[PDB]
Amino acid sequence: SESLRIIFAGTPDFAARHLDALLSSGHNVVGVFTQPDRPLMPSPVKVLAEEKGLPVFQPVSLRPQENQQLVAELQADVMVVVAYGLILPKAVLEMPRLGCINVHGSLLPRWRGAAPIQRSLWAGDAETGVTIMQMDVGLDTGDMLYKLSCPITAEDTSGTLYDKLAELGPQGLITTLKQLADGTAKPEVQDETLVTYAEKLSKEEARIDWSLSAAQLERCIRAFNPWPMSWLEIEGQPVKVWKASVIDTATNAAPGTILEANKQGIQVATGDGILNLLSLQPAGKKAMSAQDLLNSRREWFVPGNRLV
């Protein structure tokens, strides 16, 4: 029942979904910190804070004591950090009364780090979720105050999981804020041994490696959607893969061998099983179905030929 003065720090839409939830549930958000304007585009959090008449602060860094003081001045009870791109110095961590609380996109201690959502999908996890944690100095080492899980379906991409977590996160956050205001929060220490780090995604890593199993390639295709998107090079042309299905049939064909190319898809042998490419997007072109591809890029997918 204690109305907490909250400083909200966040940047992307995922973060904006959480701010919107805090406001909508009558929370006392005293200030909003977002990353400085980007080439010059304002963040989804900045846009929403503004529309709501909230003071926005965009220090390029919290290292300067001048910037740290902006947090001090707001005399906050807790600082909620959701996808805010700046490192918080221990000094700032100690400033709000109840400290800083972070909404992390994984079921900690698994997937500490930068790309928890994409990595849980890529790794083949059966589920993800969000962990609301009491921020500490390391990279996502804080005690877990709350966790909500969400299963990862076979049709999920990092994009849909983001959607799912953007809906789960706010409720977990509001619940946790209630517990902190009530003194009923039950902090759980992270088991170091269960930790894994969700390293950033790169376009280099998204390039299709046919020697992998069709299952993992199919997972990469989903996990790397919307960014960086799995891709292969054909005639020095980067081609993004939007959809593929796995054909659980063993092949003696070398990885990369096109086994079939028709309306049903372009089947490619992998290191284990067959990957059926369904939607590909040649650079600077539209995302085309296998049939469209056979009409405009036939020579790229001749059965018997080997990709890559």
- In DSSP notation, 62-121 reads S-SHHHHHHHHHTT-SEEEEES--SPPPHHHHHSSTT-EEEEESSSTTTTBSS-HHHHHH
Name residue, tokens 């946790």: 176
Those residues whose C-beta lies under 8 Å from the C-beta of residue 301, and which sit 6 or more positions away, are 258, 261, 266, 293, 294
Q: Do residues 217 and 224 touch, judged by C-beta distance below 8 A? A: no
Upstream peptide bond of 228 is cis (omega within 30 degrees of 0): yes
d(CA 270, CA 234): 17
Coil/strand/helix, residue 19: helix
Tokens of 214: 């069709």
Coil/strand/helix, residue 150: strand
Q: Do residues 240 and 281 touch, judged by C-beta distance below 8 A? A: yes
H or E stretch at 159: helix 158-182
d(CA 297, CA 305): 14
DSSP 199-239: PPP-HHHHB--TTSBHHHHHHHHHHTTTTT--EEEETTEEE
The CATH 3.10.25.10 portion of the chain extends over 203-307
- For residue 264, what are the CA distances in angstroms to 234, 261, 277, 284, 289? 20, 8, 9, 24, 9
Resolution of the experimentally solved model in angstroms: 2.0
H or E stretch at 138: none
**Approach to solving:** X-ray
DSSP state of 132: E
CATH of domain 1-202: 3.40.50.170
Tokens of 263: 């309306």
Class assignment of domain 203-307?
Answer: alpha beta
Spatial CA neighbour of 165 closest among 225, 118, 105, 122: 105
Tally of helices (H runs) and strands (E runs) in the chain: 9, 13
- For residue 128, what are the CA distances in angstroms to 170, 220, 243? 15, 16, 22
Those residues whose C-beta lies under 8 Å from the C-beta of residue 67, and which sit 6 or more positions away, are 59, 61
Question: Pseudo-torsion of CA 197, 120, 134, 50, nearest 10°?
Answer: 110
Q: Is 109 annotated as a binding residue?
A: yes
- Residue 290: φ, ψ to 5°: -55, -40
Q: Do residues 33 and 81 touch, judged by C-beta distance below 8 A? A: no
Q: Do residues 158 and 226 touch, judged by C-beta distance below 8 A? A: yes
Spatial CA neighbour of 268 closest among 228, 226, 209: 209
Q: Do residues 58 and 84 touch, judged by C-beta distance below 8 A? A: no
d(CA 256, CA 254): 6
Q: Is 61 annotated as a binding residue?
A: no
Q: Do residues 47 and 53 touch, judged by C-beta distance below 8 A? A: no
From the CB of residue 242, how many other CB atoms can be counted at a distance below 10 Å? 18
Q: How far is CA 163 from the centre of its chain?
A: 10
Q: Do residues 45 and 19 touch, judged by C-beta distance below 8 A? A: yes
The CATH 3.40.50.170 portion of the chain extends over 1-202
From the CB of residue 36, how many other CB atoms can be counted at a distance below 10 Å? 14
Q: Is 107 annotated as a binding residue?
A: yes
